[PDB]
Structure formats: structure tokens, C-alpha cells
Amino acid sequence: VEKFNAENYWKKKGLAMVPLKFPVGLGSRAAGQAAALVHIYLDGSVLVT
Amino acid sequence: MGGQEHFYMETQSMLVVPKGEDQEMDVYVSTQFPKYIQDIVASTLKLPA
């Protein structure tokens, strides 16, 4: 890219790299609370929500 | 001893509404045994319960 920028005047190239640390979490324990409901019918099939 | 008619004031009534996805079907029936309605309809449509 440095070779391109020195050879060209009206067109330039660029390069960059950034790191990432993304913390994951809510405010309290009660905010990460989840629930579900599962049924099993007599034919063997399952309904989940 | 002679027979008898139930003569419920609400005659046999039902509405059957397909959802349009995965052949989902909701039946709204005047019945006593919703599980039986679920079975005979699922068996007829060759669908899991």
C-alpha cells in the first residue's frame, strides 16, 4: 500500500487493523433470567416455547 | 327402555383454521375431549400432534 501511495497521486490505498474485547452481561442476575415450557404428546412429538 | 337424545342447546359446531406454516392447524370445536380431537385430526392429516 505504501508502494501504491508513492506511485499514485489522485488515488490512495489504506490499511488498518483493530482489536476487539466485547464484554457481555446485564445489570443484575434478575435481568438474565429465562424460562421455558415443554410438552410431550402421546405420539412422541414435543412442543417447546 | 327407550333411548334418549342429548339435545344440547348448542349443536355440533367447529371452526378449523390452518396457520399456513408447517401445516399448523388450530381447531376451535365444541367438544369434551380436546385431546381426542387433536389425535383424530393429526392422524387424518398425517401430522405429528
Coordinates of all heavy atoms in Angstrom, one line a residue:
Chain A
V1 N 0.8 -1.2 0.0 CA 0.0 0.0 0.0 C 0.9 1.3 0.0 O 0.6 2.2 -0.7 CB -1.0 0.0 1.2 CG1 -1.6 1.3 1.4 CG2 -2.1 -1.1 1.0
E2 N 2.0 1.2 0.8 CA 2.9 2.4 0.7 C 3.5 2.5 -0.6 O 3.8 3.6 -1.1 CB 4.0 2.2 1.8 CG 3.5 2.0 3.2 CD 4.6 1.8 4.2 OE1 5.5 2.6 4.2 OE2 4.5 0.9 5.1
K3 N 3.7 1.4 -1.4 CA 4.2 1.5 -2.7 C 3.2 2.1 -3.6 O 3.5 2.9 -4.5 CB 4.5 0.1 -3.3 CG 5.0 0.0 -4.7 CD 5.4 -1.4 -5.1 CE 5.9 -1.4 -6.5 NZ 4.8 -1.0 -7.5
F4 N 1.9 1.9 -3.4 CA 0.8 2.5 -4.2 C 0.7 3.9 -4.0 O 0.5 4.7 -4.9 CB -0.5 1.7 -4.0 CG -1.6 2.2 -4.9 CD1 -1.8 1.6 -6.1 CD2 -2.5 3.2 -4.5 CE1 -2.9 2.0 -6.9 CE2 -3.5 3.6 -5.3 CZ -3.7 3.0 -6.5
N5 N 0.8 4.4 -2.7 CA 0.6 5.8 -2.4 C 1.7 6.6 -2.9 O 1.5 7.8 -3.3 CB 0.5 5.9 -0.9 CG -0.7 5.2 -0.3 OD1 -1.7 5.1 -0.9 ND2 -0.5 4.8 1.0
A6 N 2.9 6.1 -3.0 CA 4.1 6.8 -3.6 C 4.0 6.8 -5.1 O 4.7 7.7 -5.7 CB 5.4 6.2 -3.1
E7 N 3.3 5.9 -5.7 CA 3.3 5.9 -7.2 C 2.1 6.6 -7.7 O 2.1 7.0 -8.9 CB 3.2 4.4 -7.7 CG 4.6 3.7 -7.5 CD 4.4 2.2 -7.9 OE1 3.3 1.7 -7.7 OE2 5.5 1.6 -8.3
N8 N 1.0 6.8 -7.0 CA -0.2 7.4 -7.4 C -0.6 8.6 -6.6 O -0.4 8.6 -5.4 CB -1.4 6.4 -7.3 CG -1.1 5.1 -8.1 OD1 -1.5 4.9 -9.2 ND2 -0.4 4.2 -7.4
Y9 N -1.0 9.6 -7.3 CA -1.3 10.9 -6.7 C -2.8 11.2 -6.4 O -3.1 11.8 -5.4 CB -0.7 12.1 -7.5 CG -0.6 13.4 -6.8 CD1 0.5 13.7 -6.0 CD2 -1.5 14.4 -7.0 CE1 0.6 14.9 -5.4 CE2 -1.4 15.6 -6.4 CZ -0.3 15.9 -5.6 OH -0.2 17.1 -4.9
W10 N -3.7 10.8 -7.3 CA -5.1 11.0 -7.2 C -5.8 9.8 -6.7 O -7.1 9.8 -6.6 CB -5.7 11.5 -8.5 CG -5.0 12.8 -9.0 CD1 -4.2 12.9 -10.1 CD2 -5.1 14.1 -8.5 NE1 -3.9 14.2 -10.3 CE2 -4.4 15.0 -9.3 CE3 -5.8 14.6 -7.3 CZ2 -4.3 16.3 -9.0 CZ3 -5.7 16.0 -7.1 CH2 -4.9 16.8 -7.9
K11 N -5.1 8.7 -6.5 CA -5.8 7.5 -5.9 C -4.8 7.0 -4.8 O -3.6 6.8 -5.0 CB -6.0 6.4 -6.9 CG -7.1 6.7 -7.9 CD -8.2 5.8 -7.8 CE -9.3 6.1 -8.9 NZ -9.7 7.5 -8.9
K12 N -5.4 6.7 -3.6 CA -4.6 6.3 -2.5 C -5.3 5.0 -1.9 O -6.5 4.8 -2.0 CB -4.5 7.4 -1.4 CG -3.8 8.6 -1.8 CD -2.3 8.3 -2.0 CE -1.5 9.6 -2.2 NZ 0.0 9.3 -2.1
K13 N -4.5 4.2 -1.3 CA -4.9 3.0 -0.6 C -4.6 3.1 0.9 O -3.8 3.9 1.3 CB -4.2 1.7 -1.1 CG -4.7 1.3 -2.5 CD -4.3 -0.1 -2.8 CE -4.8 -0.6 -4.2 NZ -4.6 -2.0 -4.4
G14 N -5.4 2.4 1.7 CA -5.2 2.4 3.2 C -5.4 1.0 3.8 O -6.1 0.2 3.2
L15 N -4.8 0.9 4.9 CA -4.9 -0.4 5.6 C -4.9 -0.1 7.1 O -4.2 0.8 7.6 CB -3.7 -1.3 5.3 CG -3.7 -2.7 5.7 CD1 -4.9 -3.4 5.1 CD2 -2.5 -3.5 5.4
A16 N -5.8 -0.9 7.8 CA -5.9 -0.7 9.3 C -6.3 -2.1 9.9 O -6.9 -2.9 9.2 CB -6.9 0.3 9.6
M17 N -6.1 -2.2 11.2 CA -6.5 -3.4 11.9 C -6.8 -3.0 13.4 O -6.0 -2.3 14.0 CB -5.4 -4.5 11.9 CG -5.8 -5.8 12.6 SD -4.5 -6.9 12.9 CE -3.8 -7.1 11.2
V18 N -7.9 -3.4 13.9 CA -8.4 -3.0 15.2 C -8.6 -4.3 16.0 O -9.0 -5.3 15.5 CB -9.6 -2.1 15.2 CG1 -9.4 -0.9 14.3 CG2 -10.8 -2.9 14.7
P19 N -8.3 -4.3 17.3 CA -8.7 -5.4 18.2 C -10.1 -5.2 18.8 O -10.7 -4.2 18.7 CB -7.6 -5.3 19.3 CG -7.4 -3.9 19.4 CD -7.5 -3.3 18.1
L20 N -10.6 -6.3 19.4 CA -11.9 -6.4 19.9 C -11.9 -7.1 21.3 O -11.5 -8.2 21.4 CB -12.9 -7.1 19.0 CG -14.3 -7.3 19.5 CD1 -15.1 -6.0 19.4 CD2 -15.0 -8.3 18.7
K21 N -12.4 -6.4 22.3 CA -12.9 -7.0 23.5 C -14.3 -6.5 23.8 O -14.5 -5.4 24.2 CB -11.9 -6.7 24.7 CG -12.4 -7.3 26.0 CD -11.4 -7.3 27.1 CE -11.5 -6.0 28.0 NZ -13.0 -5.7 28.2
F22 N -15.3 -7.4 23.6 CA -16.7 -7.1 23.8 C -17.2 -7.7 25.1 O -17.5 -8.9 25.1 CB -17.5 -7.5 22.6 CG -19.0 -7.0 22.7 CD1 -19.3 -5.7 22.6 CD2 -20.0 -8.0 23.0 CE1 -20.6 -5.3 22.7 CE2 -21.3 -7.6 23.1 CZ -21.6 -6.2 22.9
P23 N -17.3 -7.0 26.2 CA -17.9 -7.6 27.4 C -19.3 -7.9 27.3 O -20.1 -7.1 26.7 CB -17.6 -6.6 28.5 CG -16.5 -5.6 27.9 CD -16.8 -5.6 26.5
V24 N -19.8 -9.0 27.8 CA -21.2 -9.4 27.7 C -21.7 -9.6 29.1 O -21.1 -10.3 30.0 CB -21.3 -10.8 26.9 CG1 -22.8 -11.2 26.9 CG2 -20.7 -10.6 25.5
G25 N -22.9 -8.9 29.4 CA -23.5 -9.0 30.7 C -24.6 -8.0 30.8 O -24.6 -7.0 30.2
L26 N -25.6 -8.3 31.7 CA -26.7 -7.4 32.0 C -26.4 -6.7 33.3 O -25.3 -6.7 33.9 CB -28.0 -8.2 32.0 CG -28.5 -8.8 30.7 CD1 -28.2 -7.9 29.5 CD2 -27.9 -10.2 30.5
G27 N -27.4 -6.0 33.8 CA -27.3 -5.2 35.1 C -27.3 -6.1 36.3 O -26.4 -5.8 37.2
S28 N -28.2 -7.0 36.5 CA -28.3 -7.8 37.6 C -28.6 -9.3 37.2 O -28.7 -9.6 36.0 CB -29.4 -7.3 38.6 OG -30.6 -7.3 38.0
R29 N -28.7 -10.2 38.2 CA -29.0 -11.6 37.9 C -30.4 -11.7 37.4 O -30.7 -12.5 36.5 CB -28.7 -12.5 39.1 CG -29.1 -13.9 38.8 CD -28.5 -14.8 39.9 NE -29.2 -14.8 41.1 CZ -29.2 -15.9 42.0 NH1 -28.6 -17.0 41.7 NH2 -29.9 -15.8 43.1
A30 N -31.3 -10.9 37.9 CA -32.8 -11.0 37.5 C -33.0 -10.5 36.1 O -34.1 -10.9 35.5 CB -33.6 -10.1 38.5
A31 N -32.1 -9.8 35.5 CA -32.2 -9.4 34.1 C -31.8 -10.5 33.1 O -32.2 -10.5 31.9 CB -31.4 -8.1 33.8
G32 N -31.0 -11.5 33.5 CA -30.6 -12.6 32.7 C -31.4 -13.8 32.9 O -31.0 -14.9 32.5
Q33 N -32.6 -13.6 33.6 CA -33.4 -14.7 33.9 C -34.3 -15.2 32.7 O -34.9 -14.3 32.0 CB -34.3 -14.3 35.1 CG -35.7 -15.1 35.2 CD -36.6 -14.4 36.2 OE1 -37.7 -14.9 36.5 NE2 -36.2 -13.2 36.6
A34 N -34.4 -16.5 32.5 CA -35.1 -17.0 31.3 C -36.0 -18.2 31.8 O -35.7 -18.8 32.8 CB -34.1 -17.5 30.2
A35 N -37.0 -18.4 31.0 CA -37.9 -19.5 31.3 C -38.4 -20.2 30.0 O -38.2 -19.6 28.9 CB -39.2 -19.0 32.1
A36 N -38.9 -21.4 30.2 CA -39.4 -22.1 29.0 C -40.5 -23.1 29.4 O -40.7 -23.3 30.6 CB -38.2 -22.9 28.4
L37 N -41.2 -23.7 28.5 CA -42.3 -24.6 28.7 C -42.2 -25.7 27.6 O -42.2 -25.4 26.4 CB -43.6 -23.9 28.7 CG -44.8 -24.8 29.0 CD1 -44.8 -25.2 30.5 CD2 -46.1 -24.0 28.8
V38 N -42.2 -27.0 28.0 CA -42.0 -28.1 27.1 C -43.2 -29.1 27.4 O -43.4 -29.5 28.5 CB -40.7 -28.8 27.3 CG1 -40.5 -30.0 26.4 CG2 -39.5 -27.8 27.1
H39 N -43.8 -29.5 26.3 CA -44.9 -30.5 26.3 C -44.4 -31.7 25.5 O -43.7 -31.6 24.5 CB -46.2 -30.0 25.7 CG -46.8 -28.8 26.5 ND1 -46.3 -28.4 27.7 CD2 -47.8 -28.0 26.1 CE1 -47.0 -27.3 28.1 NE2 -47.9 -27.1 27.2
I40 N -44.8 -32.9 25.9 CA -44.6 -34.1 25.2 C -45.9 -34.8 25.0 O -46.5 -35.3 26.0 CB -43.6 -35.1 26.0 CG1 -42.2 -34.4 26.0 CG2 -43.5 -36.4 25.2 CD1 -41.1 -35.3 26.6
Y41 N -46.4 -35.0 23.8 CA -47.6 -35.6 23.5 C -47.5 -37.1 23.4 O -46.4 -37.6 23.2 CB -48.2 -35.0 22.2 CG -48.5 -33.5 22.3 CD1 -47.7 -32.6 21.7 CD2 -49.6 -33.0 23.0 CE1 -47.9 -31.2 21.9 CE2 -49.9 -31.7 23.2 CZ -49.0 -30.8 22.6 OH -49.3 -29.4 22.7
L42 N -48.6 -37.8 23.4 CA -48.6 -39.2 23.5 C -48.1 -39.9 22.2 O -47.9 -41.1 22.2 CB -50.0 -39.8 23.8 CG -50.2 -40.1 25.3 CD1 -49.9 -39.0 26.2 CD2 -51.7 -40.5 25.5
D43 N -48.0 -39.2 21.1 CA -47.4 -39.7 19.9 C -45.9 -39.6 19.8 O -45.3 -40.0 18.9 CB -48.0 -39.0 18.7 CG -47.5 -37.6 18.5 OD1 -47.2 -36.9 19.5 OD2 -47.4 -37.1 17.3
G44 N -45.3 -39.0 20.9 CA -43.9 -38.8 20.9 C -43.4 -37.4 20.5 O -42.2 -37.1 20.8
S45 N -44.2 -36.6 19.9 CA -43.8 -35.3 19.5 C -43.7 -34.3 20.7 O -44.3 -34.5 21.7 CB -44.7 -34.7 18.4 OG -46.0 -34.6 19.0
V46 N -42.9 -33.3 20.5 CA -42.6 -32.3 21.6 C -42.9 -30.9 21.1 O -42.5 -30.5 20.0 CB -41.1 -32.4 22.0 CG1 -40.8 -31.3 23.0 CG2 -40.9 -33.8 22.6
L47 N -43.5 -30.1 21.9 CA -43.8 -28.7 21.7 C -43.1 -27.9 22.7 O -43.3 -28.1 23.9 CB -45.3 -28.4 21.7 CG -45.7 -27.0 21.2 CD1 -45.4 -26.8 19.7 CD2 -47.1 -26.7 21.6
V48 N -42.2 -27.0 22.3 CA -41.4 -26.2 23.2 C -41.7 -24.7 22.9 O -42.0 -24.3 21.8 CB -39.9 -26.5 23.1 CG1 -39.5 -26.2 21.6 CG2 -39.1 -25.6 24.0
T49 N -41.7 -23.9 24.0 CA -41.8 -22.4 23.9 C -41.0 -21.8 24.9 O -40.7 -22.4 26.0 CB -43.3 -22.0 24.0 OG1 -43.4 -20.6 24.0 CG2 -43.9 -22.5 25.3
Chain B
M1 N -86.7 -50.3 27.5 CA -86.4 -48.9 27.8 C -85.9 -48.2 26.6 O -84.9 -48.6 26.0 CB -85.4 -48.8 29.0 CG -85.1 -47.4 29.4 SD -84.0 -47.3 30.9 CE -83.7 -45.5 31.0
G2 N -86.6 -47.1 26.2 CA -86.2 -46.4 25.0 C -85.0 -45.5 25.2 O -84.5 -45.2 26.3
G3 N -84.5 -45.0 24.0 CA -83.3 -44.2 24.0 C -83.6 -42.8 24.4 O -84.7 -42.4 24.8
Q4 N -82.6 -41.9 24.2 CA -82.7 -40.5 24.5 C -81.8 -39.7 23.6 O -80.7 -40.2 23.1 CB -82.3 -40.3 26.0 CG -83.1 -39.2 26.7 CD -82.4 -38.7 28.0 OE1 -81.3 -39.1 28.3 NE2 -83.1 -37.8 28.7
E5 N -82.1 -38.5 23.4 CA -81.3 -37.5 22.6 C -80.6 -36.6 23.6 O -81.3 -36.1 24.6 CB -82.1 -36.8 21.6 CG -81.9 -37.2 20.1 CD -80.5 -37.0 19.6 OE1 -79.8 -36.1 20.2 OE2 -80.1 -37.8 18.7
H6 N -79.4 -36.3 23.4 CA -78.7 -35.3 24.2 C -79.4 -34.0 24.2 O -79.7 -33.4 25.2 CB -77.2 -35.1 23.7 CG -76.5 -36.4 23.5 ND1 -75.9 -37.1 24.5 CD2 -76.3 -37.1 22.4 CE1 -75.3 -38.2 24.0 NE2 -75.5 -38.2 22.7
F7 N -79.8 -33.5 23.0 CA -80.5 -32.2 22.8 C -79.8 -31.1 23.6 O -80.4 -30.3 24.3 CB -81.9 -32.3 23.2 CG -82.9 -31.5 22.3 CD1 -83.6 -32.1 21.3 CD2 -82.9 -30.1 22.5 CE1 -84.5 -31.3 20.5 CE2 -83.8 -29.3 21.7 CZ -84.5 -30.0 20.7
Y8 N -78.5 -31.0 23.4 CA -77.7 -29.9 23.9 C -78.2 -28.6 23.1 O -78.5 -28.8 21.9 CB -76.2 -30.1 23.7 CG -75.9 -31.0 22.6 CD1 -76.2 -30.7 21.2 CD2 -75.3 -32.3 22.8 CE1 -75.9 -31.5 20.2 CE2 -75.0 -33.1 21.8 CZ -75.3 -32.8 20.5 OH -75.0 -33.6 19.4
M9 N -78.2 -27.5 23.7 CA -78.8 -26.3 23.1 C -77.9 -25.8 22.0 O -78.3 -25.2 21.0 CB -79.1 -25.2 24.1 CG -80.4 -25.5 24.9 SD -81.8 -25.9 23.8 CE -82.0 -24.4 22.9
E10 N -76.6 -26.0 22.1 CA -75.6 -25.7 21.0 C -75.3 -26.9 20.2 O -74.7 -27.9 20.8 CB -74.3 -25.1 21.6 CG -73.3 -24.8 20.6 CD -71.9 -24.5 21.2 OE1 -71.5 -25.3 22.1 OE2 -71.2 -23.6 20.7
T11 N -75.7 -27.0 19.0 CA -75.5 -28.1 18.1 C -74.0 -28.2 17.8 O -73.2 -27.4 18.2 CB -76.3 -28.0 16.8 OG1 -75.9 -26.8 16.2 CG2 -77.8 -28.0 17.1
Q12 N -73.6 -29.3 17.1 CA -72.3 -29.5 16.7 C -71.7 -28.4 15.9 O -72.2 -28.0 14.8 CB -72.2 -30.8 15.9 CG -72.7 -32.1 16.6 CD -71.8 -32.6 17.7 OE1 -70.7 -32.0 18.0 NE2 -72.2 -33.6 18.4
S13 N -70.7 -27.7 16.5 CA -70.1 -26.5 15.9 C -68.6 -26.6 16.0 O -68.1 -27.0 17.0 CB -70.6 -25.2 16.6 OG -72.0 -25.3 16.8
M14 N -67.9 -26.2 14.9 CA -66.5 -26.2 14.9 C -66.0 -25.3 13.8 O -66.6 -25.1 12.8 CB -65.9 -27.6 14.8 CG -66.1 -28.2 13.4 SD -65.8 -30.0 13.5 CE -67.1 -30.5 14.6
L15 N -64.8 -24.7 14.0 CA -64.1 -23.9 13.0 C -62.6 -24.4 13.0 O -62.0 -24.5 14.1 CB -64.2 -22.4 13.3 CG -63.3 -21.5 12.5 CD1 -63.8 -21.5 11.0 CD2 -63.2 -20.1 13.0
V16 N -62.1 -24.6 11.8 CA -60.8 -25.2 11.6 C -59.9 -24.2 10.8 O -60.3 -23.9 9.6 CB -60.8 -26.6 11.0 CG1 -59.5 -27.3 11.2 CG2 -62.0 -27.4 11.6
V17 N -58.9 -23.7 11.4 CA -58.1 -22.6 10.7 C -56.6 -23.0 10.5 O -55.9 -23.1 11.5 CB -58.2 -21.3 11.6 CG1 -57.4 -20.2 10.9 CG2 -59.6 -20.9 11.8
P18 N -56.2 -23.3 9.3 CA -54.8 -23.5 9.0 C -54.0 -22.3 9.2 O -54.4 -21.2 8.7 CB -54.8 -24.1 7.6 CG -56.0 -23.4 6.9 CD -57.0 -23.3 8.0
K19 N -52.8 -22.4 9.8 CA -51.9 -21.3 10.0 C -51.1 -20.9 8.8 O -50.8 -19.7 8.7 CB -51.0 -21.6 11.2 CG -50.4 -20.4 11.9 CD -51.5 -19.7 12.7 CE -51.0 -18.4 13.4 NZ -52.1 -17.8 14.3
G20 N -50.8 -21.8 7.9 CA -50.1 -21.5 6.7 C -48.6 -21.8 6.8 O -47.8 -21.5 5.9
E21 N -48.1 -22.3 8.0 CA -46.7 -22.7 8.2 C -46.7 -24.1 8.8 O -47.4 -24.4 9.7 CB -46.0 -21.7 9.1 CG -46.1 -20.3 8.6 CD -45.3 -19.4 9.5 OE1 -44.7 -19.9 10.5 OE2 -45.2 -18.1 9.3
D22 N -45.8 -24.9 8.2 CA -45.5 -26.3 8.7 C -46.8 -27.1 8.9 O -46.9 -28.0 9.7 CB -44.8 -26.2 10.1 CG -43.5 -25.4 10.0 OD1 -42.7 -25.7 9.1 OD2 -43.3 -24.5 10.8
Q23 N -47.8 -26.8 8.1 CA -49.1 -27.4 8.1 C -49.7 -27.3 9.5 O -50.4 -28.2 10.0 CB -49.1 -28.8 7.6 CG -48.0 -29.2 6.7 CD -48.0 -30.6 6.2 OE1 -48.9 -31.1 5.6 NE2 -46.9 -31.3 6.5
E24 N -49.4 -26.2 10.2 CA -50.0 -26.0 11.5 C -51.5 -25.8 11.4 O -52.0 -25.1 10.5 CB -49.4 -24.8 12.2 CG -48.2 -25.1 13.1 CD -47.5 -23.8 13.5 OE1 -48.1 -22.8 13.9 OE2 -46.2 -23.8 13.3
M25 N -52.3 -26.4 12.3 CA -53.8 -26.3 12.3 C -54.3 -26.0 13.7 O -53.9 -26.7 14.6 CB -54.4 -27.6 11.7 CG -53.9 -27.9 10.3 SD -54.9 -27.3 8.9 CE -56.5 -27.7 9.6
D26 N -55.1 -25.0 13.8 CA -55.9 -24.7 15.0 C -57.3 -25.1 14.8 O -58.0 -24.5 14.0 CB -55.7 -23.3 15.5 CG -54.3 -22.8 15.3 OD1 -53.4 -23.2 16.1 OD2 -54.0 -21.9 14.5
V27 N -57.9 -26.0 15.6 CA -59.3 -26.3 15.6 C -60.0 -25.7 16.8 O -59.4 -25.7 17.9 CB -59.5 -27.9 15.6 CG1 -58.7 -28.5 14.4 CG2 -59.0 -28.5 16.9
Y28 N -61.1 -25.1 16.5 CA -61.9 -24.5 17.6 C -63.3 -25.3 17.6 O -64.1 -25.0 16.7 CB -62.2 -23.0 17.3 CG -60.9 -22.2 17.2 CD1 -60.3 -21.9 16.0 CD2 -60.2 -21.8 18.4 CE1 -59.1 -21.2 15.9 CE2 -59.0 -21.1 18.3 CZ -58.5 -20.8 17.1 OH -57.3 -20.1 17.0
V29 N -63.4 -26.2 18.5 CA -64.5 -27.1 18.5 C -65.3 -27.0 19.8 O -64.8 -26.6 20.8 CB -64.0 -28.6 18.3 CG1 -65.1 -29.5 17.8 CG2 -62.7 -28.6 17.4
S30 N -66.6 -27.4 19.7 CA -67.5 -27.6 20.8 C -67.4 -29.1 21.1 O -68.1 -29.9 20.6 CB -68.9 -27.1 20.5 OG -69.7 -27.3 21.6
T31 N -66.5 -29.4 22.1 CA -66.3 -30.8 22.4 C -65.9 -31.0 23.8 O -65.6 -30.0 24.5 CB -65.2 -31.4 21.5 OG1 -64.8 -32.7 22.0 CG2 -63.9 -30.5 21.5
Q32 N -65.9 -32.2 24.3 CA -65.5 -32.5 25.7 C -64.1 -33.1 25.7 O -63.5 -33.0 26.8 CB -66.4 -33.6 26.3 CG -67.9 -33.2 26.3 CD -68.8 -34.4 26.5 OE1 -69.3 -35.0 25.5 NE2 -69.1 -34.7 27.7
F33 N -63.5 -33.6 24.6 CA -62.2 -34.3 24.7 C -61.3 -33.6 23.6 O -61.2 -34.1 22.5 CB -62.4 -35.8 24.3 CG -61.4 -36.7 24.9 CD1 -61.5 -38.0 24.8 CD2 -60.3 -36.1 25.5 CE1 -60.5 -38.9 25.3 CE2 -59.3 -37.0 26.0 CZ -59.4 -38.3 25.9
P34 N -60.7 -32.5 24.0 CA -59.8 -31.8 23.1 C -58.6 -32.7 22.6 O -58.1 -32.5 21.5 CB -59.3 -30.6 23.8 CG -60.4 -30.4 24.8 CD -60.9 -31.7 25.2
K35 N -58.1 -33.6 23.5 CA -57.0 -34.4 23.1 C -57.5 -35.4 22.0 O -56.7 -35.6 21.1 CB -56.5 -35.2 24.3 CG -55.5 -36.3 24.0 CD -55.3 -37.3 25.1 CE -54.6 -38.5 24.7 NZ -55.2 -39.2 23.5
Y36 N -58.7 -35.9 22.1 CA -59.2 -36.8 21.0 C -59.3 -36.1 19.7 O -59.0 -36.6 18.6 CB -60.5 -37.4 21.4 CG -61.2 -38.2 20.3 CD1 -60.7 -39.4 19.9 CD2 -62.3 -37.7 19.7 CE1 -61.3 -40.1 18.9 CE2 -62.9 -38.4 18.7 CZ -62.4 -39.6 18.3 OH -63.1 -40.3 17.3
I37 N -59.8 -34.8 19.7 CA -59.9 -34.0 18.5 C -58.5 -33.8 18.0 O -58.3 -33.8 16.7 CB -60.6 -32.7 18.8 CG1 -62.0 -32.9 19.4 CG2 -60.7 -31.8 17.6 CD1 -63.0 -33.2 18.4
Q38 N -57.5 -33.5 18.8 CA -56.2 -33.4 18.4 C -55.6 -34.6 17.7 O -54.9 -34.5 16.7 CB -55.3 -33.0 19.6 CG -53.8 -32.8 19.3 CD -53.0 -32.4 20.5 OE1 -53.1 -33.0 21.6 NE2 -52.1 -31.5 20.3
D39 N -56.0 -35.8 18.3 CA -55.4 -37.0 17.7 C -56.0 -37.4 16.4 O -55.3 -37.7 15.4 CB -55.7 -38.2 18.7 CG -54.9 -38.0 20.0 OD1 -54.1 -37.1 20.1 OD2 -55.2 -38.7 21.0
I40 N -57.4 -37.3 16.3 CA -58.0 -37.7 15.0 C -57.7 -36.8 13.9 O -57.7 -37.2 12.7 CB -59.5 -37.9 15.3 CG1 -60.2 -38.5 14.0 CG2 -60.2 -36.5 15.6 CD1 -61.7 -38.9 14.3
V41 N -57.5 -35.5 14.2 CA -57.2 -34.5 13.2 C -55.7 -34.7 12.7 O -55.4 -34.7 11.6 CB -57.4 -33.1 13.7 CG1 -56.8 -32.1 12.7 CG2 -58.9 -32.8 13.7
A42 N -54.8 -34.9 13.7 CA -53.4 -35.1 13.4 C -53.3 -36.4 12.6 O -52.5 -36.5 11.7 CB -52.6 -35.1 14.6
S43 N -54.0 -37.5 13.0 CA -53.9 -38.8 12.3 C -54.5 -38.6 10.9 O -53.9 -39.2 10.0 CB -54.7 -39.8 13.1 OG -54.9 -41.0 12.3
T44 N -55.6 -37.9 10.7 CA -56.1 -37.7 9.4 C -55.2 -36.9 8.5 O -55.0 -37.3 7.3 CB -57.5 -36.9 9.5 OG1 -58.4 -37.7 10.2 CG2 -58.0 -36.6 8.1
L45 N -54.5 -35.8 9.0 CA -53.6 -35.0 8.3 C -52.2 -35.7 8.2 O -51.3 -35.1 7.6 CB -53.5 -33.6 8.8 CG -54.8 -32.8 8.9 CD1 -54.6 -31.5 9.5 CD2 -55.5 -32.7 7.5
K46 N -52.0 -36.8 8.8 CA -50.7 -37.5 8.8 C -49.6 -36.6 9.4 O -48.5 -36.6 8.9 CB -50.3 -38.0 7.5 CG -51.4 -38.7 6.7 CD -50.9 -39.3 5.4 CE -50.4 -40.7 5.7 NZ -51.2 -41.8 5.1
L47 N -50.0 -35.8 10.4 CA -49.1 -34.8 11.1 C -48.8 -35.3 12.5 O -49.7 -35.9 13.1 CB -49.7 -33.4 11.1 CG -50.0 -32.8 9.7 CD1 -50.7 -31.5 9.9 CD2 -48.7 -32.6 9.0
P48 N -47.7 -34.9 13.1 CA -47.5 -35.1 14.5 C -48.4 -34.2 15.3 O -48.9 -33.2 14.8 CB -46.0 -34.7 14.7 CG -45.4 -34.7 13.3 CD -46.5 -34.4 12.4
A49 N -48.6 -34.6 16.6 CA -49.5 -33.9 17.4 C -49.1 -32.5 17.7 O -50.0 -31.6 17.9 CB -49.7 -34.7 18.8

